[PDB]
Write a protein that binds this DNA or RNA. Sequence first.
RNA 1: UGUCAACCGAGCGUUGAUCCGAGGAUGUCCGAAUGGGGAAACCCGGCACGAGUGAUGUCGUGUCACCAGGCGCUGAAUAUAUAGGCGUCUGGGGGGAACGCGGGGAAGUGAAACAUCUCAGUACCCGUAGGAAGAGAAAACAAAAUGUGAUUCCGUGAGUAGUGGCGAGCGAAAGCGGAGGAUGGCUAAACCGUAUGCAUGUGAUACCGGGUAGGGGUUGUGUGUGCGGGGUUGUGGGACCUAUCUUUCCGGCUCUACCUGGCUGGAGGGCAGUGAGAAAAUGUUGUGGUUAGCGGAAAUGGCUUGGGAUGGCCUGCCGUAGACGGUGAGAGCCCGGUACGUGAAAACCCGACGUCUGUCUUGAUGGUGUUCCCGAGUAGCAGCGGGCCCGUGGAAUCUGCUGUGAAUCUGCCGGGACCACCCGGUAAGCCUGAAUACUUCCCAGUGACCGAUAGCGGAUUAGUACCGUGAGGGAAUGGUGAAAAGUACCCC
RNA 2: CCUGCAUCCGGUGAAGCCGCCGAGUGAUCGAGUGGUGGAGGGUGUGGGAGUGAGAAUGCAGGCAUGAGUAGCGAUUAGGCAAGUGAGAACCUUGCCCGCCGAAAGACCAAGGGUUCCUGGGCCAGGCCAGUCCGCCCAGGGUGAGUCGGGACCUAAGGCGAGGCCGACAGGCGUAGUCGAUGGACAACGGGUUGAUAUUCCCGUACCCGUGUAUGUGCGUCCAUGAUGGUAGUCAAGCGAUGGGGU
RNA 3: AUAUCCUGAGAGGUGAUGCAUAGCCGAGUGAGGCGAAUUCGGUGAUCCUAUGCUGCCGAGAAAAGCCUCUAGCGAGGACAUA
Lengths: 63, 97
Amino acid sequence: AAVCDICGKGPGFGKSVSHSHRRTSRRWNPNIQPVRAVTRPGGNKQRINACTSCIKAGKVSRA
Amino acid sequence: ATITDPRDIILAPVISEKSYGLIEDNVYTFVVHPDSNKTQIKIAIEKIFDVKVDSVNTANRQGKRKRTRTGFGKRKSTKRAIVKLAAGSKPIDLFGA
RNA sequence: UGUCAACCGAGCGUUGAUCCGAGGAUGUCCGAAUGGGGAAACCCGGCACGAGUGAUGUCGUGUCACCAGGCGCUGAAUAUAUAGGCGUCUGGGGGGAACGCGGGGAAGUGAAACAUCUCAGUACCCGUAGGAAGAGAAAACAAAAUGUGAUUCCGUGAGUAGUGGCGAGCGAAAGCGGAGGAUGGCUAAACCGUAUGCAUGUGAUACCGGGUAGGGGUUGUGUGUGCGGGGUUGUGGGACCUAUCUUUCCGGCUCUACCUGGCUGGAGGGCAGUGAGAAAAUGUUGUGGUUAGCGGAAAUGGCUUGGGAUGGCCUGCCGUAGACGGUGAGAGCCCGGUACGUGAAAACCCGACGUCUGUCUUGAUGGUGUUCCCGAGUAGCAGCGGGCCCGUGGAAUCUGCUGUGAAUCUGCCGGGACCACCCGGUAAGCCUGAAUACUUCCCAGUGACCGAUAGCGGAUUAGUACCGUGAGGGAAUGGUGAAAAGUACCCC
RNA sequence: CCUGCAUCCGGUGAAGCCGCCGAGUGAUCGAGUGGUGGAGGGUGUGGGAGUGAGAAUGCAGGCAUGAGUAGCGAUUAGGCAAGUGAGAACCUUGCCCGCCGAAAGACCAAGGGUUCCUGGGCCAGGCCAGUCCGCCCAGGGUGAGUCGGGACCUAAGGCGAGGCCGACAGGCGUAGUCGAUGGACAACGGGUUGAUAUUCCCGUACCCGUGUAUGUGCGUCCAUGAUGGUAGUCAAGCGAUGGGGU
RNA sequence: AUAUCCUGAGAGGUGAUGCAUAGCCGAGUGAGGCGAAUUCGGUGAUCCUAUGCUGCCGAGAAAAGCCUCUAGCGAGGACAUA
Ligand SMILES: [Mg+2]
Ligand SMILES: [Mg+2]
Ligand SMILES: [Mg+2]
Ligand SMILES: [Mg+2]
Ligand SMILES: [Mg+2]
Ligand SMILES: [Mg+2]
Ligand SMILES: [Mg+2]
Ligand SMILES: [Mg+2]
Ligand SMILES: [Mg+2]
Ligand SMILES: [Mg+2]
Ligand SMILES: [Mg+2]
Ligand SMILES: [Mg+2]
Ligand SMILES: [Mg+2]
Ligand SMILES: [Mg+2]
Ligand SMILES: [Mg+2]
Ligand SMILES: [Mg+2]
Ligand SMILES: [Mg+2]
Ligand SMILES: [Mg+2]
Ligand SMILES: [Mg+2]
Ligand SMILES: [Mg+2]
Ligand SMILES: [Mg+2]
Ligand SMILES: [Mg+2]
Ligand SMILES: [Mg+2]
Ligand SMILES: [Mg+2]
Ligand SMILES: [Mg+2]
Ligand SMILES: [Mg+2]
Ligand SMILES: [Mg+2]
Ligand SMILES: [Mg+2]
Ligand SMILES: [Mg+2]
Ligand SMILES: [Mg+2]
Ligand SMILES: [Mg+2]
Ligand SMILES: [Mg+2]
Ligand SMILES: [Mg+2]
Ligand SMILES: [Mg+2]
Ligand SMILES: [Mg+2]
Ligand SMILES: [Mg+2]
Ligand SMILES: [Mg+2]
Ligand SMILES: [Mg+2]
Ligand SMILES: [Mg+2]
Ligand SMILES: [Mg+2]
Ligand SMILES: [Mg+2]
Ligand SMILES: [Mg+2]
Ligand SMILES: [Mg+2]
Ligand SMILES: [Mg+2]
Ligand SMILES: [Mg+2]
Ligand SMILES: [Mg+2]
Ligand SMILES: [Mg+2]
Ligand SMILES: [Mg+2]
Ligand SMILES: [Mg+2]
Ligand SMILES: [Mg+2]
Ligand SMILES: [Mg+2]
Ligand SMILES: [Mg+2]
Ligand SMILES: [Mg+2]
Ligand SMILES: [Mg+2]
Ligand SMILES: [Mg+2]
Ligand SMILES: [Mg+2]
Ligand SMILES: [Mg+2]
Ligand SMILES: [Mg+2]
Ligand SMILES: [Mg+2]
Ligand SMILES: [Mg+2]
Ligand SMILES: [Mg+2]
Ligand SMILES: [Mg+2]
Ligand SMILES: [Mg+2]
Ligand SMILES: [Mg+2]
Ligand SMILES: [Mg+2]
Ligand SMILES: [Mg+2]
Ligand SMILES: [Mg+2]
Ligand SMILES: [Mg+2]
Ligand SMILES: [Mg+2]
Ligand SMILES: [Zn+2]
């Protein structure tokens, strides 16, 4: 739950602000889920972490 | 290339009252290289002095520690061996008493 | 025949010692440690070739990690095939005082308190290479001037325009003047060829510019990929037809033989070359400098005090050399050397002079109307955060994440919301030296800087003794005199 | 005090220190004189200061009183004759007395490294003097097929090829290899020098390996046998990285 | 069945015509030589049989080695003596 193995999108770091205008540390992590990639026509897939961006763009096929 | 010789392991003799007594009883005491072995001593000595040898023994002692106004120093550490000649009893003249 | 620091015994040298300059071998063990093991410098092996014993026991020289990337063989449950397994080559594991790039990232303290702020993007950490790095060829400014023209670094522009519990504080840009010259080059798209596959075929009147004609495969027609031409831009450009001008020879092809228009090979003549624009090697110069050395001028002057003249008085000489040190007391002419000249076996690097490599001349020049192209989850939009003076405020621009999601030249984006009219430009791919930053080391120089409680903690046994089981802390100790001639000898 | 400039002094004695004699309204001065010394100084006018001490329970070094006062670190206690030497209650010899003796004795492992012996002396140390020493100097001294460890095996635990997870840094744990306080494993009595002893010697034992010779002696090549009875295997001898006991 | 096997204290013989010692001679920092008897009773263990036996529950390491089995190699190997 860190980075997409394909596009390598790492998490970004920022500062969270309360309604009292006081600052504090917080982190944002890109949406990535475990899916079996469709790359070989042979009909075999392997467990690889992927990101919604790559999945929806189809860089790893759906089948 | 290097040349191995059985005469490069034994270093020097030791002169003392105990050594003289052991010589009287036909036993000699040599100084041997720290990394040598009893088999080394036996094979080398028999080969060089063409005299049958019965048994060998080895012993080592730590170096002394002397004072110096500069600081503290240590002498060298030596390993010495004991050789008992066989019944042949061929005296060695090179020792020179 | 190094040195602390005398003393003895031993020896070499005119047949060139010692010394210094360049290159070359050996180089025990630990230390990324990598034959295996482990509490640093200590224990135990395999294999091959040699040495030794009547044979084991023994000994010498090689070789015996891991990971990643190529290449070859092999193909499990399981069939296609994969994972996995073997053989062989190429690379990497650590260290370094400062200098850079991208991230993470704190608390003391001011506001006479303090949450926002500031301290500060500081200390520290992480991943990273170099001798420098990064950045870089406008989707840039300005405003009716017919302006500038890549980037970087300094000085102004000003403590002003702004911002802030409008407190404490924080802080630009444009323009202008300087250092440098390369206002440089590459790459995917529009279309033909070629190794292919996936396909299907009316498998025959379609593939080839016209005419004579032979046939049914340069597949008849589509798709994705590797390989060579033609193109690289803003007054838009590039691909197709249509006229004009056309600065070597020959061959094979445009299915085929014959004329017309195109594709490709073999030979002049230019073009450059270690180069960013393509890469590899091989044949002949600079008293270019550097790593040592060598030459190098003139008073034993006289008189005086003196232990000692390098002190005082009087006479000389050199000066392309009166910088600086030593010598028994302040020395141009005593010594070391200074001005100046020379000078290298080997090696270094620079520059210049020579085989070889490769694009183009099958090609270039100025026009015309029509059909296709100009960098995809991108631009923009909505939500949540950063840093620009802008501390969400109307919020421009850049950027991180999540959803939605566009077009190809009367297209698109920019001139601090936004609309209309004007003006500039062509992002979503990649390289690029010169102007700049720094010294752990070496060479040469300087001090209205310190002289032993000062000066680096360290002028001597120095990061030693010592303290602490640890990170760590951290001491004081120079002057005899010209030479030791260091007081023979006698006496208590 | 250091400096630019122009001057003067100095082995016929320059700088500090200790006196005498004097002098200015002050911080002080003396090119006025005496002893010590041996190597650089003064005046005039400019420029620059780490430029002026008595106190912060300041710091480095040296030294005052209490002071020749307290103590001289137990629960046993010494005395005598002789010797050594300059020195003796504290050293050596001999004779009495006392104390300890589940230790105030004889040993192992851990712990220190030369304190062990021989020879030299007593400016440093021993709470006093020392001929003495756990002071120092110079030399010498440590002997294992069988004792303790390694080459044999393992635990609580550590490392960790692959791998999982994690923004990076990093946390886990498989196969394996490390890790005695355990398991198995083969020697006892006596003598010996100034220092070594299940180690050397004497006497007698035990456990693994290699070579030669000899005797039992069994098969490969013949072939009886047992068979499952022409033919095909075989039970010799080794025997596990595997199974089962212990 | 004290059948058979294993184990096994203690006793007995061997090791030992050897070694050592009370003592006797000379000989003194000390060495040398010679060298007797060595039978019977009591007491009695915290040591052996003993990883025994009897009771109790809170219910009590692994590997290696040794024996055996085949799988599998196999024509020289096993035993004894020197
Ligand atoms: Mg990730
Ligand atoms: Mg940040
Ligand atoms: Mg904060
Ligand atoms: Mg010492
Ligand atoms: Mg050299
Ligand atoms: Mg070598
Ligand atoms: Mg290694
Ligand atoms: Mg290792
Ligand atoms: Mg590879
Ligand atoms: Mg398959
Ligand atoms: Mg590195
Ligand atoms: Mg306040
Ligand atoms: Mg406050
Ligand atoms: Mg700031
Ligand atoms: Mg570099
Ligand atoms: Mg650039
Ligand atoms: Mg860029
Ligand atoms: Mg400004
Ligand atoms: Mg202020
Ligand atoms: Mg092309
Ligand atoms: Mg192109
Ligand atoms: Mg004189
Ligand atoms: Mg003179
Ligand atoms: Mg001078
Ligand atoms: Mg001189
Ligand atoms: Mg001088
Ligand atoms: Mg000279
Ligand atoms: Mg703001
Ligand atoms: Mg805003
Ligand atoms: Mg406007
Ligand atoms: Mg225009
Ligand atoms: Mg563009
Ligand atoms: Mg620069
Ligand atoms: Mg002084
Ligand atoms: Mg410590
Ligand atoms: Mg002065
Ligand atoms: Mg003078
Ligand atoms: Mg004088
Ligand atoms: Mg005088
Ligand atoms: Mg003097
Ligand atoms: Mg002046
Ligand atoms: Mg002044
Ligand atoms: Mg000033
Ligand atoms: Mg000051
Ligand atoms: Mg004072
Ligand atoms: Mg004090
Ligand atoms: Mg007092
Ligand atoms: Mg008193
Ligand atoms: Mg008293
Ligand atoms: Mg006491
Ligand atoms: Mg006495
Ligand atoms: Mg008692
Ligand atoms: Mg008792
Ligand atoms: Mg007691
Ligand atoms: Mg211990
Ligand atoms: Mg020890
Ligand atoms: Mg002693
Ligand atoms: Mg003594
Ligand atoms: Mg004394
Ligand atoms: Mg003392
Ligand atoms: Mg001593
Ligand atoms: Mg031994
Ligand atoms: Mg493990
Ligand atoms: Mg690993
Ligand atoms: Mg692990
Ligand atoms: Mg271990
Ligand atoms: Mg153990
Ligand atoms: Mg012993
Ligand atoms: Mg009992
Ligand atoms: Zn992705």
